[PDB]
Design a protein around this ligand. Structure first.
Ligand SMILES: Cc1cc2nc3c(=O)[nH]c(=O)nc-3n(C[C@H](O)[C@H](O)[C@H](O)COP(=O)(O)OP(=O)(O)OC[C@H]3O[C@@H](n4cnc5c(N)ncnc54)[C@H](O)[C@@H]3O)c2cc1C
Ligand SMILES: Cc1cc2nc3c(=O)[nH]c(=O)nc-3n(C[C@H](O)[C@H](O)[C@H](O)COP(=O)(O)OP(=O)(O)OC[C@H]3O[C@@H](n4cnc5c(N)ncnc54)[C@H](O)[C@@H]3O)c2cc1C
Lengths: 442, 442
């Protein structure tokens, strides 16, 4: 239905939260309800000393259900992948919503405590709009509306259903781990319970004192882990890069991809003949998979209606937001290689004006063309589908900003669209160098 | 031995950390080593979504060993009693060390996030002096020194031993739960696994939505819990006060102490005949027990050498710091009803000057007299032994401030002793009113 009055937001993390404020700023909707399985908003910024109960090794299925840690004396806990000593890899000049600045004297790459407090503040006025400790089981178009099925998190809660005109899925994409099925991995992992970890389980580095570790992966997370393990793990630290690396010294030995895990001898074979033995911990820093764990959406498999396939990305979403077949279904926060808060805010502001009717989407065929062209430029690398590495991200948010400006009628209070000027872009372009200089690395 | 060179500090929380800086500032010790079972410093300020594995119900033994939650993929976690939405009950104008202020724009009674960050900043330069993830098993005077036995937290670590000339115990006193043994409690607790809780298990209030709750206790913690449960628990919330209470309305029904727990009818008898039934959760906010879990110290039972008896306090400690029989053994952080950070700094400042010899303690008989007089003024209420409720804390910290000022020789850099002038004392005196007005309560 075009006239949208009741909206459901799946998730109360940074993306769902900014989506709510933008929607509520339209003064056009009668109901905006956020659903959150955690007892509080903030998404992954809810640091949990608790680890996931069972790591799937290997992990290649994007539909995997997240099992919360439960007990008789506590609300169920959904572990967050944030680790103890984490500091941002995004500067305060760029991260964070454009209309809530950081307090003065804040470190440029602050500890998570600062971001957890920043989110707590941001979300406080939204609490009455959120159904906390509530897990959304399924989402499906029935008649002319969306039927969202959910169950209160808490033993004995009854399954319930409510219907909305639109649904914005902001469930995040850093929950289902991605661990490639390698020869002998499974058996290797099960023979020694904590010998095979993933980055989502990392919390405290003191666990690795004296141990010989093999970090697998070459992304930012893998490199960050190597630096964090360097002062504690036994030297050297091994890092398995896809094409091998140029660093081979006393503290770090970069090696090629893994060929096979020898369950019997506990040896690890690397492409090129190199073989590692006596590895106490193998930590996969291979990222996660996109997920749409809602049976009615997950079953969709046709090229024009599918959302998920291999979890490399979410398909059929115009501008990475609107589900082409039916734009009353949207996503906020799918962007990869971006500054999270600002980017989700740019999408929320646009999403709000389109759903209220102050802005119109181009034709269904044009939206589909936008996709064809993207798919073509990916040359088969679908995990880059939602990637907006600079300058794509700067251009993207400025594009959404300029579009939002065209909304009509003009409202007395306009929910802002972030905008990156010459200065903001320069910082984003040299982000990793500014970060490297801040932490005295590289 | 009087010439102290090597000092061991048990615990790397607010107390052990400020004791480290005060000691190092004397420039008179060759070795200052902090031991800490947790992976990081900061004491209880390490928020843990992880609950204690097994709540002892009832709990009356102060020697009870703290069991950390362990797993094959993580460093052992020692759950903290801090809850999710916790904000301080001490204003920034007084809490915190006198030589480290809070950043600008900090809330008068900040969320734990702010305080966890504060402790992180304060403890950072001390990381190389702390043996992290290390549990001290025992402490005993052997020959002329103190032998401290410890084991690295982490499966398989070997039991190790090191000697020191002095030992400062800063193990905290809010770990071992105190739950009075009432008739039928044990059975009533074991019948329904999560029916009986302790304040140390509280984390997220959404777990109590719709439930009927009995909060037992009249101290601050109990009243805080009542307010936090008010918007979620089924009305009214029951609070068992020792002498009953004056509040009886739709949302809060204060009642007298508990007489018995009827396992069979799950009924709760209150002094005066009043009986409660259909209580989903009973939350004991009856506080904690002081604990000295070191065999060589816990076995001491003679009047002149005992440290712990019923866990109401730690005996034989001159000024709540020096163990009278052997002052090379001291405690920091025992104070009750005080503003923690400053008060522990006031002690550390004094302890440091005494142990380096720049200050001298009075005679042993004069120390014992100080204790006799304290015991006399207590009138049998031993759990008030370490209580320094204003103006006692104000006078105490200022007394230590003035003593430290007499240390000689003067050092180029003098570790500061907090001091509470007319302004400070004022805030301390009306602290609970200022707090009430801040959170708009009472
Ligand atoms: C290790 C790590 C480090 C990071 N460091 C930074 C950094 O330094 N800077 C930065 O800007 N970003 C960082 N990020 C990125 C982070 O993803 C974003 O900051 C931000 O959390 C994006 O949030 P969201 O709402 O899109 O996702 P999330 O924070 O993942 O929130 C999703 C929310 O939806 C809920 N939810 C999911 N499914 C359901 C369901 N079925 N029913 C009900 N609720 C559901 C979740 O429980 C959760 O609260 C990091 C991420 C990781 C994993
Ligand atoms: C629910 C709650 C709320 C509070 N709110 C406030 C507040 O708002 N403001 C305020 O000022 N104070 C508050 N406090 C008080 C708090 O006790 C102090 O702020 C501060 O933590 C004092 O710490 P410490 O070093 O004395 O103790 P702790 O913080 O308890 O630290 C003791 C440390 O020693 C370690 N340890 C113990 N035994 C051993 C061993 N055998 N071997 C190795 N390490 C060991 C522990 O693991 C721990 O890290 C609160 C306390 C609780 C329980």
């Amino acid at each position: 239905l075009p006239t949208i009055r009741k909206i459901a937001i799946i998730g109360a993390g940074p993306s769902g939260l900014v989506t709510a404020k933008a929607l509520l700023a339209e003064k056009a909707f009668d109901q905006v309800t956020l659903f959150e399985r955690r007892g509080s908003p903030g998404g992954v910024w809810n640091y949990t000393s608790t680890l996931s109960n069972k790591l799937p090794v290997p992990s290649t299925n994007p539909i995997l259900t997240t099992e919360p840690i439960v007990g008789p004396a506590a609300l169920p806990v959904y572990p967050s992948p944030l680790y103890r000593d984490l500091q941002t890899n995004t500067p305060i000049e760029l991260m964070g919503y454009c209309d809530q600045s950081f307090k003065p004297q804040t470190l440029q790459f602050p500890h998570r405590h600062t971001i957890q407090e920043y989110q707590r503040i941001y979300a406080q006025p939204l609490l009455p709009f959120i159904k906390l400790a509530t897990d959304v089981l399924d989402i499906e178009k029935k008649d002319g509306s969306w039927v969202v099925t959910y169950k209160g998190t808490k033993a004995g809660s009854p399954i319930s259903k409510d219907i909305f005109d639109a649904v914005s899925i902001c469930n995040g994409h850093y929950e289902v781990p991605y661990i490639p099925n390698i020869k002998g991995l499974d058996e290797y992992a099960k023979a020694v319970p904590g010998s095979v970890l993933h980055s989502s389980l990392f919390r405290e580095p003191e666990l690795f004192v004296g141990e010989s570790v093999l970090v697998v992966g070459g992304a930012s997370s893998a490199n960050d882990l190597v630096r964090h393990l360097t002062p504690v793990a036994k030297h050297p630290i091994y890092q398995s890069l896809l094409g091998g690396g140029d660093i081979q010294n006393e503290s770090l030995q970069q090696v090629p991809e893994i060929t096979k895990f020898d369950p019997t001898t506990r040896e690890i074979y690397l492409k090129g003949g190199k073989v590692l033995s006596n590895i106490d911990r193998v930590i996969y820093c291979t990222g996660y998979l996109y997920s749409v764990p809602f049976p009615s959406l997950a079953k969709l498999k046709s090229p024009e209606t599918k959302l998920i396939d291999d979890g490399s990305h979410v398909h059929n979403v115009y501008q990475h937001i609107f589900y082409i077949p039916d734009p009353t279904l949207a996503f906020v926060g799918l962007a990869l290689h971006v500054v999270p808060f600002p980017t989700s805010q740019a999408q929320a502001a646009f999403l709000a004006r389109v759903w209220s009717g102050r802005l119109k989407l181009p034709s269904k065929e044009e939206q589909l063309k936008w996709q064809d062209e993207l798919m073509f430029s990916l040359s088969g690398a679908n995990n880059m589908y939602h990637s907006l590495d600079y300058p794509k991200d700067a251009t993207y948010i400025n594009k959404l900003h300029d579009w939002c400006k065209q909304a009509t009628p003009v409202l007395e209070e306009e929910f802002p669209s972030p905008y990156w000027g010459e200065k903001e872009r320069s910082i984003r372009e040299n982000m990793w160098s500014i970060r490297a200089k801040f932490f005295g690395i590289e």
